[PDB]
Design a protein around this ligand. Structure first.
Ligand code: NA
Length: 461
């Protein structure tokens, strides 16, 4: 992705957009009960912690575009992936405005808590004043579509989350490029059924895992993989995508019966952005921070892995490539060993910066004992080996519990963490609960004991 130009929004006909400059994050009742070294990301140029230009740091994610056209390998990748999806027999019909708005089987209703984007954010109109989840009224939406149309500018927000000390000083704050409610709605109408087919089919046929439930899905993954696992992490995935990867995506969409509206992808590829009093144009790069794009990134990931395997290992049998992606995150496999570093090398030529799985310094063999997916390890249950535990290390859980965004949500936030932590074992979980119960706020929470979560789990299958 590359920023073509940037200038004052007034100069091109747009208003100034106000974005909160103060973090909602602050020490929780457990700040000193658990170890942690992360703080709230920088949200403004003046932040005292900053050790470099903020504006320059947040936009530096656009490394540029390494490729213009789709080569032979990418085309081969497209034909293979498109072919796989074809077996899902996905419904190509456009989805009605009602379901696109209030959801249907396999698609959740629009999230009322996220920005409505332009121009509503500049009119002080929230999603609430537009949809009645109990009425399922489309009149208002329809009138707005007719009024403001589509292909609107994306509104940029600095993400309010925890980051390491280094990233705070280097102004490496992640960004959210929220698309207008109009486009988000138009796209769900165009691809709603594609979205549904994916949510209902997490696995190696869609090569996707969006919409999956880790507690249950972790027991299906091992059976879907080949003998040899391989994996790696991406540095700035979304931002690094070149226009060609969007064209490859459209080719897949055309082949599976959505050629009807591949133009919506152009909107993601050549995008229009608003930030503060500025407006800028980007070529390439997948608009970040939101769920609407998870599926397209996953599809593209499937195209990438396939392409690098064809360019590096001529004669490879893609029919035996078994992979599952969640945006840029991926766990893959093949009957034969492959070299991630070699693949990493082939990747540089495609605009992707690939590095060792899980922040390793060197590319080591990926095994069932060291692989992670969605920050979670895999661990067979001691009593019932066929049941697989998704295990998230306590470290990130400790980091998270030390802060709070709304005292009113302490109960939900801590319960959330409990659902993640108990998979670490009864000993660890109990220590966790005891430390929570060492301060007043914790003793007042309603939290599930271990045997209760274990029983619930065995009963969810
Ligand atoms: Na873009």
């Amino acid at each position: 992705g590359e920023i073509q130009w940037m200038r004052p929004s007034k100069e091109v006909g747009y208003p100034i957009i106000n974005a909160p400059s103060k973090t909602k994050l602050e020490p929780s009742a457990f700040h000193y009960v658990f170890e942690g070294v992360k703080e709230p990301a920088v949200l403004t140029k003046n932040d005292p912690r900053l050790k470099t230009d903020f504006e320059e740091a947040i936009f530096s994610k656009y490394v540029g575009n390494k490729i213009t056209e789709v080569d032979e390998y990418m085309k081969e990748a497209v034909d293979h992936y498109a072919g796989q999806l074809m077996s899902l027999d996905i419904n190509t019909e456009q989805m009605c405005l009602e379901d696109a708005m209030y959801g249907t089987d396999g698609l959740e209703a629009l999230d009322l808590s996220t920005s409505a984007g332009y121009p509503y954010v500049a009119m002080g109109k929230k999603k609430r004043d537009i949809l009645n989840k109990q009425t399922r009224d489309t009149k208002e939406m329809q009138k707005l579509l007719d009024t403001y149309g589509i292909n609107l500018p994306l509104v940029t927000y600095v993400k309010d989350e925890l980051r390491s000390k280094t990233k705070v000083e280097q102004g490496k704050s992640r960004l959210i490029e929220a698309s207008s409610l109009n486009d988000s709605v138009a796209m769900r109408m165009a691809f709603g059924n594609l979205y549904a087919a994916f949510h209902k089919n997490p696995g190696v046929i869609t090569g996707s895992a969006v919409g999956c439930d880790p507690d249950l899905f972790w027991s299906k993954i091992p059976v879907l993989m080949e003998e040899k696992l391989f994996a790696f992490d991406y540095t700035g995935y979304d931002a690094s995508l070149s226009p060609a990867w969007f064209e490859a995506l459209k080719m897949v969409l055309e082949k599976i019966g959505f050629g009807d509206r591949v133009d919506y992808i152009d909107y993601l590829n050549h995008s229009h952005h608003l930030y503060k009093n500025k407006t800028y144009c980007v070529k390439g790069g997948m608009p970040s921070g939101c769920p609407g794009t998870s599926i397209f990134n996953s599809m593209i990931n499937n195209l990438i892995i396939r392409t690098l395997l064809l360019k590096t290992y001529k004669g490879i049998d893609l029919d035996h490539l078994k992979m599952i992606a969640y945006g840029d995150d991926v766990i893959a496999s093949y009957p034969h060993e492959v070299d991630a570093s070699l693949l990493a090398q082939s990747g540089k030529d495609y605009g992707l910066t690939m590095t060792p799985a899980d922040k390793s310094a060197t590319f080591e063999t990926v095994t069932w004992e060291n692989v992670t997916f969605l920050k979670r390890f895999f661990r067979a249950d001691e009593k019932y080996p066929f049941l697989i535990h998704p295990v998230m290390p306590m470290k990130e859980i400790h980091e998270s519990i030390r802060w709070t965004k709304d005292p009113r949500n302490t109960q939900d936030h801590v319960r959330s963490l409990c659902l993640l932590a108990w998979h670490n074992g009864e000993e660890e979980y109990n220590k966790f609960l005891a430390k929570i119960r060492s301060v007043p706020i914790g003793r007042a929470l309603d939290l599930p004991e271990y045997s209760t979560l274990y029983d619930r789990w065995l009963d969810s299958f």
